Scaffold this active site. Structure first.
Site, PDB file in Angstrom:
ATOM      1  CG  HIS A  63       9.462   9.362  20.766  1.00  0.00           C
ATOM      2  ND1 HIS A  63       8.631  10.469  20.780  1.00  0.00           N
ATOM      3  CD2 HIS A  63      10.588   9.733  21.422  1.00  0.00           C
ATOM      4  CE1 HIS A  63       9.226  11.458  21.426  1.00  0.00           C
ATOM      5  NE2 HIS A  63      10.416  11.035  21.827  1.00  0.00           N
ATOM      6  CG  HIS A  93      12.534   1.790  16.073  1.00  0.00           C
ATOM      7  ND1 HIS A  93      13.819   1.962  15.606  1.00  0.00           N
ATOM      8  CD2 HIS A  93      11.728   2.488  15.225  1.00  0.00           C
ATOM      9  CE1 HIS A  93      13.789   2.731  14.527  1.00  0.00           C
ATOM     10  NE2 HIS A  93      12.536   3.057  14.261  1.00  0.00           N
ATOM     11  CG  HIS A  95       7.276   3.405  13.401  1.00  0.00           C
ATOM     12  ND1 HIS A  95       7.413   4.659  13.959  1.00  0.00           N
ATOM     13  CD2 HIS A  95       8.503   3.045  12.960  1.00  0.00           C
ATOM     14  CE1 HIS A  95       8.682   5.020  13.891  1.00  0.00           C
ATOM     15  NE2 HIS A  95       9.367   4.045  13.307  1.00  0.00           N
ATOM     16  CD  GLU A 105       7.658   5.661  10.549  1.00  0.00           C
ATOM     17  OE1 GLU A 105       8.888   5.398  10.475  1.00  0.00           O
ATOM     18  OE2 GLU A 105       7.200   6.718  11.076  1.00  0.00           O
ATOM     19  CG  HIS A 118      11.704   1.260  10.788  1.00  0.00           C
ATOM     20  ND1 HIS A 118      11.240   2.534  10.983  1.00  0.00           N
ATOM     21  CD2 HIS A 118      11.065   0.792   9.690  1.00  0.00           C
ATOM     22  CE1 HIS A 118      10.355   2.831  10.051  1.00  0.00           C
ATOM     23  NE2 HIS A 118      10.246   1.801   9.235  1.00  0.00           N
ATOM     24  CB  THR A 198      10.496   8.000  10.073  1.00  0.00           C
ATOM     25  OG1 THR A 198      10.560   7.176  11.255  1.00  0.00           O
ATOM     26  CG2 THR A 198      10.945   7.202   8.846  1.00  0.00           C
ATOM     27  CB  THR A 199      11.724  10.157  14.907  1.00  0.00           C
ATOM     28  OG1 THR A 199      12.968   9.488  15.124  1.00  0.00           O
ATOM     29  CG2 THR A 199      10.611   9.163  14.932  1.00  0.00           C
TER      30      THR A 199
HETATM   31  C1  LIG Z   1      21.401   9.569  17.006  1.00  0.00           C
HETATM   32  C2  LIG Z   1      19.999   9.851  16.413  1.00  0.00           C
HETATM   33  O1  LIG Z   1      19.389   8.531  16.386  1.00  0.00           O
HETATM   34  C3  LIG Z   1      18.200   8.463  15.699  1.00  0.00           C
HETATM   35  C4  LIG Z   1      17.216   9.469  15.666  1.00  0.00           C
HETATM   36  C5  LIG Z   1      16.049   9.232  14.935  1.00  0.00           C
HETATM   37  C6  LIG Z   1      15.815   8.018  14.238  1.00  0.00           C
HETATM   38  N1  LIG Z   1      14.734   7.631  13.461  1.00  0.00           N
HETATM   39  C7  LIG Z   1      14.850   6.373  12.943  1.00  0.00           C
HETATM   40  S1  LIG Z   1      13.758   5.508  11.903  1.00  0.00           S
HETATM   41  N2  LIG Z   1      12.198   5.474  12.414  1.00  0.00           N
HETATM   42  O2  LIG Z   1      14.378   4.162  11.844  1.00  0.00           O
HETATM   43  O3  LIG Z   1      13.782   6.110  10.579  1.00  0.00           O
HETATM   44  S2  LIG Z   1      16.355   5.611  13.446  1.00  0.00           S
HETATM   45  C8  LIG Z   1      16.825   7.021  14.327  1.00  0.00           C
HETATM   46  C9  LIG Z   1      17.974   7.266  15.032  1.00  0.00           C
HETATM   47 ZN   LIG Z   2      11.443   3.757  12.723  1.00  0.00          ZN
END
Ligand SMILES: CCOc1ccc2nc(S(N)(=O)=O)sc2c1
Ligand SMILES: [Zn+2]
Length: 259
Positions: A63, A93, A95, A105, A118, A198-199
């Site tokens: 991803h 990370h 996008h 995003e 992010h 956002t995921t």
């Molecule tokens: C333990 C679950 O960890 C997760 C799962 C999804 C997720 N999405 C983002 S974001 N794109 O920064 O909004 S940080 C994150 C951490």
């Molecule tokens: Zn993100």
């Protein structure tokens, strides 16, 4: 559905089939209407305190590309802003898009950037672990930074050349001594609002802090991101691009601006 992703059949428009909160009232990202942001002078100053950030690994997870940090101490923290206390940095990370026109995003007044970074922090004061904090209210503080295309960025070659090592989904490589101070813009002005991951699992656990000023990278550095694959070593090759969730309805939330 059998999985989630960014394709036709498993993409953001279908996530709600497995993740009903997808259609909730605090979902991210959003379109930030600059002139409908509420000034908030009451906000404390935003302090990305990263002097001893100790990086541990870089990883393609299908991803995004992602770098992790040790978070045993309150060494590397975000504090101030709308945060009622310090948050321990976990990871960053990115996008990004097919083309220059798309990739970020959040949008500002309808406009996208070619990428968005992010930096994910968690509330280790309240919660005992990051996975716990990640789905709890006021569990996370995510700082986002847009990226434009322009001249080169030196500090960001150490990152960008490592992208060759982790090009297939599932591959992880040691990534010691990368301080993400070098991905922050001069200005610490920002917008903030309550939202979500956002995921998946799309938990409504996030206080979002989106910086006003972008950083520049070169079309060349930008291209190395597009040379990552969504897919693993033993599958057909499909490059990682358009790994972003479109903006979501605001359903009455307030976006505060610190400037
Ligand atoms: C333990 C679950 O960890 C997760 C799962 C999804 C997720 N999405 C983002 S974001 N794109 O920064 O909004 S940080 C994150 C951490
Ligand atoms: Zn993100």
């Amino acid at each position: 559905m059998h999985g989630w992703g960014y394709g036709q059949d498993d993409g953001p428009s279908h996530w709600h089939k497995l993740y009903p909160i997808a259609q909730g009232d605090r979902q991210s990202p959003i379109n930030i209407i600059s002139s409908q942001a509420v000034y908030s002078p009451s906000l404390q100053p935003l302090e990305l305190s990263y002097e001893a950030c100790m990086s541990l690994s870089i990883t393609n997870n299908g991803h995004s590309v992602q770098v992790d940090f040790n978070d045993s101490d309150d060494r590397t923290v975000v504090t101030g802003g709308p945060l009622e206390g310090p948050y321990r940095l976990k990871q960053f990370h990115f996008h990004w898009g097919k083309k220059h026109d798309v990739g970020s995003e959040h949008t500002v007044d309808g406009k996208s950037f070619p990428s968005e970074l992010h930096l994910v922090h968690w509330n280790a004061k309240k919660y005992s672990t990051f996975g716990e904090a990640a789905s709890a209210p006021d569990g996370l503080a995510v700082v986002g930074v847009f990226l434009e295309t322009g001249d080169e960025h030196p500090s960001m070659n150490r990152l960008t050349d490592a992208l060759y090592m982790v090009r297939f989904k599932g591959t992880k490589a040691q990534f010691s001594c990368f301080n993400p101070k070098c991905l922050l813009p001069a200005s610490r002005h920002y917008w903030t609002y309550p939202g979500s991951l956002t995921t998946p699992p799309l938990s409504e656990s996030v206080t979002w802090i989106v910086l006003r000023e972008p950083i520049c990278i070169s079309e060349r550095q930008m291209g190395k991101f597009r040379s990552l694959l969504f897919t693993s070593e033993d599958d057909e090759r499909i490059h990682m691009v358009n790994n972003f969730r479109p903006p979501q309805p605001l359903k009455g939330r307030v976006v505060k601006a610190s400037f």
